[PDB]
Design a protein around this ligand. Structure first.
Ligand code: LI1
Ligand code: LI1
Ligand code: LI1
Ligand code: LI1
Ligand code: LI1
Ligand code: LI1
Ligand code: LI1
Ligand code: LI1
Ligand code: LI1
Ligand code: LI1
Ligand code: LI1
Ligand code: SQU
Ligand code: SQU
Ligand code: SQU
Ligand code: RET
Ligand code: RET
Ligand code: RET
Lengths: 222, 222, 222
């Protein structure tokens, strides 16, 4: 359509949907409780992602925010996307190590403050305050990843599995605040169509790729 | 008032409130844990429903959406209603059969995508895309009901109880996407005042009736 | 800034942030599960509160509502604040006595109807209906506190601890609907800058003070 980033919203819609289906069919048959939790958690993300990517593609997940002298297109559906799918990722990581509730409660709460303050940053009309919200949202993320290491006697399956998804996690998660800071929402260094592609690349890798790495091990079975 | 559907919003407000009270007084005395969960879940729905029906009655739960050449009155409070009360219904059904977490997580998540995409459909200005959101929301519902049967060794109390509320569930739940598709939100086949009545009839039967069928058995006691 | 209540939004921002930090550092080291839940719950509130107080301070958490012949400044971030932090308080109180799920589900649900209908009251343009929402929100709160006493064999630690925070709870919680009713949102008896101070005084005492009373006892340790 008229928006150059359309192609990347369409490709991400497509990869999120083909990914959930894969996951659905993959999930049919399974009857292991625990396994019935990663499939759930793991399948729902691009499931939710699918709808949120489609809401962007069709234009619903978009709003205009004025700042720095203009009308900046802002896809709030991302935050609705992540606010629902980041704890799924942290729940998959959490259940993985068997985290006590107090820390899981601490992770999703920092999580909604992370997405929550990320979304506040996204829609704040005062340019310099956008970077205050980023800094608090980055400190919460920066907080979560700190727990993601020394925040916690596991089986060598889930654990080695835990190294991967955590390292893929720091790099992936930390890449998100850099793309925000450099794209149209932040300094405006990188064009929205490139930022959209970077986010869809992280989202598909986060949703589908990270998905394709977790459930393909017996780290998930009880 | 000026809106012909007012009478049905007022009657539903009334039946939701008299229903929660019934449930409240009914619930006082009870000290069985499990039983303390159906009363909770079961009472809260028309409790929440009451407030959401009243917000419609008083006009707050209403917004105007342009499409197909006009300003269509849209009661978003329904989705806020269902987004909060449909998992209560699925939690009552779920706890009922004792569903593992992975499937309960899978049901509420499809559930918020169901209400979530239903609400997206409801407020999307592009007429043909409204029917795409309906189709995904119907596929999630269509998904949930599929689990509602072959998605799972129970006592003959909860189980026979489970036949009822599930069958009342498929017919009730499946009636909702038909009323949406045929009313003002969808094809506009049926007037808003008739659609409102159908929804309030399903909502009262869903909230109060379905309520009046569950807790009046020892299928709920531990 | 131009708003006289700014000073109180700035002080509350500050006290909420210094308070979470205190709590964070206090929380580092702890490895007791249960204790890892009060710190979580307890720390997150002024954590969330911090961001919501800052969103008010910077102007984001504010909207204008017309009624009684004018444009009344309304800080919706409070409800987003409380909707997220009141169940944390009730979870701290709940876990404290070890409440069965049915009642905890019943408390947060009345809770979101309390904040939920409080927020509806806050943004309703019809003046007399604002007081209907207050009355339902007060009845839910009035409901929660009723459970807060006779809504439930505990250790003399958590229990005596329970007397305090509950009594501090009724007075604190009940003070909130009085400040609402008397401030700019309600009868307009008390100026917004005084109402803001009263709420920040309750919020800081609720978030930080109530915080500073709970975790400083072994009522929290397992
Ligand atoms: C807990 C634990 C975590 C709490 C974290 C602390 C920080 C929380 C902050 C929150 C505040 C949200 C801000 C937002 C509600 C305010 C919207 O106002 C915008 C401009 O002021 C409206 O612009 C117009 C554009 C609008 C677009 C915004 C809509 C988005 C909504 C996404 C949520 C969805 C929920 C699924 C719905 C079904
Ligand atoms: C950082 C704090 C300690 C934590 C809390 C956040 C408080 C303030 C955040 C950082 C701070 C403002 C950034 C200052 C931005 C400032 C240079 C704006 C430049 O002025 C120009 C016109 O006045 C902006 O118009 C348009 C020109 C623009 C392209 C300017 C872009 C500004 C960019 C901000 C970059 C911030 C990242 C360094 C921080 C990475 C660490
Ligand atoms: C470091 C810590 C907080 C830093 C303190 C700051 C003090 C602000 O001084 C004034 C700048 O002249 C702010 O008022 C100037 C008018 C405006 C007020 C801005 C107030 C905010 C900048 C204060 C909120 C702190 C921010 C959050 C920094 C995020 C951090 C947690 C990553
Ligand atoms: C964005 C990508 C990097 C693009 C570059 C692609 C090639 C580089 C991939 C990065 C990855 C490397 C991490 C290796 C892992 C293996 C380490 O496993 C250890 C075994 O116990 C885990 O302990 C602890 C493990 C530690 C792992 C955390 C590493 C740190 C995260 C690095 C930051 C990232 C980049 C943040 C945004 C960036 C794009 C600007
Ligand atoms: C999880 C698991 C499930 C996630 C499911 C995936 C699909 C999620 C989609 C969500 C997106 C919600 C759309 C909505 C936020 C966007 C609002 O923008 C409208 C037009 O663009 C505003 O019109 C003006 C009218 C506006 C009316 C809309 C308001 C409604 C809000 C209902 C929520 C309430 C929460 C209780 C509040 C206290
Ligand atoms: C169905 C897909 C495979 C799943 C994903 C959804 C993608 C598209 C959804 C179905 C599809 C559009 C419906 C096409 C509607 C089309 C006839 C609109 C008619 O054109 C008129 C003017 O151009 C509409 O104006 C006003 C006149 C109106 C009264 C027209 C009403 C249209 C109605 C749509 C009915 C859809 C239900 C069949 C689908 C039940 C299955
Ligand atoms: C069946 C499955 C998905 C169907 C594929 C469709 C392909 C769309 O082709 C073009 C129509 O000319 C859409 O671009 C035309 C311009 C516009 C783009 C519309 C894109 C969407 C129609 C694609 C999203 C699929 C929808 C979801 C169908 C719901 C289903 C899960 C019940
Ligand atoms: C809207 C109402 C139907 C209006 C008509 C009122 C009279 C008909 C009531 C329908 C009901 C009939 C179902 C009977 C039930 C009893 C079956 O129990 C079985 C015992 O194991 C359960 O297995 C499996 C049981 C199976 C039950 C699922 C049935 C299917 C659901 C039928 C669809 C409904 C209609 C969807 C919307 C409609 C209004 C257009
Ligand atoms: C469950 C259990 C509990 C359910 C309780 C029953 C009562 C629920 C009622 C809810 C309804 C919410 C009303 C609101 C969505 C409607 C907004 O419309 C306003 C005027 O109509 C918009 O004005 C413009 C101003 C707007 C400001 C309102 C925004 C606020 C949003 C706060 C939520 C945040 C979520 C964190 C986001 C990240
Ligand atoms: C109470 C019900 C049984 C429960 C459900 C709620 C339904 C109605 C709520 C109470 C009721 C209206 C309050 C009536 C307000 C009425 C006096 C408004 C006064 O009229 C003036 C112009 O017409 C208001 O303009 C501006 C002048 C204003 C300053 C008037 C302020 C009105 C105040 C309302 C005070 C209500 C508290 C008593 C209730 C405490 C118990
Ligand atoms: C707003 C403050 C009161 C300002 C005044 C400051 C001095 C008065 C502090 C009030 C407090 C007094 C409560 C004492 C407590 C000790 C009782 O403990 C009992 C031991 O089992 C608990 O049983 C049951 C205990 C019972 C406790 C519940 C008391 C009731 C709550 C009183 C209402 C408050 C005021 C509501 C708003 C007001 C500000 C208009
Ligand atoms: C064969 C299997 C395992 C999966 C393929 C199903 C297709 C849809 C989504 C999965 C695609 C690829 C794996 C995810 C990995 C990535 C790091 C995602 C970023 C790349 C984006 C475009 C490149 C191609 C791919 C989408 C296959
Ligand atoms: C006597 C008991 C069990 C309940 C009556 C309390 C009143 C309020 C709500 C309950 C009403 C009726 C039972 C619910 C069943 C229905 C299928 C609802 C649809 C009907 C709507 C109008 C018809 C009358 C009734 C509301 C009694
Ligand atoms: C020394 C410790 C325990 C705490 C101090 C850290 C500072 C920040 C927040 C804590 C402040 C005070 C305790 C909370 C109690 C109150 C009833 C709050 C209302 C008072 C507001 C202003 C008065 C001063 C104080 C904020 C210290
Ligand atoms: C969908 C999956 C992933 C893991 C999404 C993760 C996204 C982030 C981790 C976001 C952090 C953000 C922060 C830290 C800074 C401001 C805005 C963001 C929301 C992009
Ligand atoms: C309040 C109780 C009940 C069971 C509500 C159930 C409602 C639905 C099941 C809705 C499904 C919808 C779908 C399937 C299609 C588009 C829009 C709806 C939200 C009405
Ligand atoms: C942040 C901590 C506390 C305990 C906040 C508690 C707030 C209330 C208890 C609010 C009740 C309200 C009611 C009862 C009446 C209408 C509006 C309010 C939301 C202020």
């Amino acid at each position: 359509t008229g928006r150059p980033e359309w192609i990347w919203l369409a490709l991400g819609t497509a990869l999120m949907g083909l990914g959930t289906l894969y996951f659905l069919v993959k999930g049919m048959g399974v009857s292991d409780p625990d396994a019935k939790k990663f499939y759930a958690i793991t399948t729902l993300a691009p499931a939710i992602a699918f709808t949120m990517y489609l809401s962007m593609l069709l234009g619903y997940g978009l709003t205009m925010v004025p700042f720095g002298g203009e009308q900046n297109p802002i896809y709030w559906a991302r935050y609705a996307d992540w606010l629902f799918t980041t704890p799924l990722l942290l729940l998959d990581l959490a259940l993985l190590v068997d985290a006590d509730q107090g820390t899981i409660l601490a992770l999703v709460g920092a999580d909604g403050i992370m997405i929550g303050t990320g979304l506040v940053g996204a829609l704040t009309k005062v340019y310099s305050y956008r970077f205050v919200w980023w800094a608090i949202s980055t400190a919460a993320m920066l907080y979560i990843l700190y727990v993601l290491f020394f925040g916690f006697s596991m089986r060598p399956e889930v654990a080695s599995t835990f190294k991967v998804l955590r390292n893929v996690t720091v790099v992936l998660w930390s890449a998100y605040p850099v793309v925000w800071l450099i794209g149209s929402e932040g300094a405006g260094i990188v064009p929205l169509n490139i930022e959209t592609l970077l986010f869809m690349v992280l989202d598909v890798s986060a949703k589908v790729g990270f998905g394709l790495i977790l459930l393909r091990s017996r780290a998930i079975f009880g």
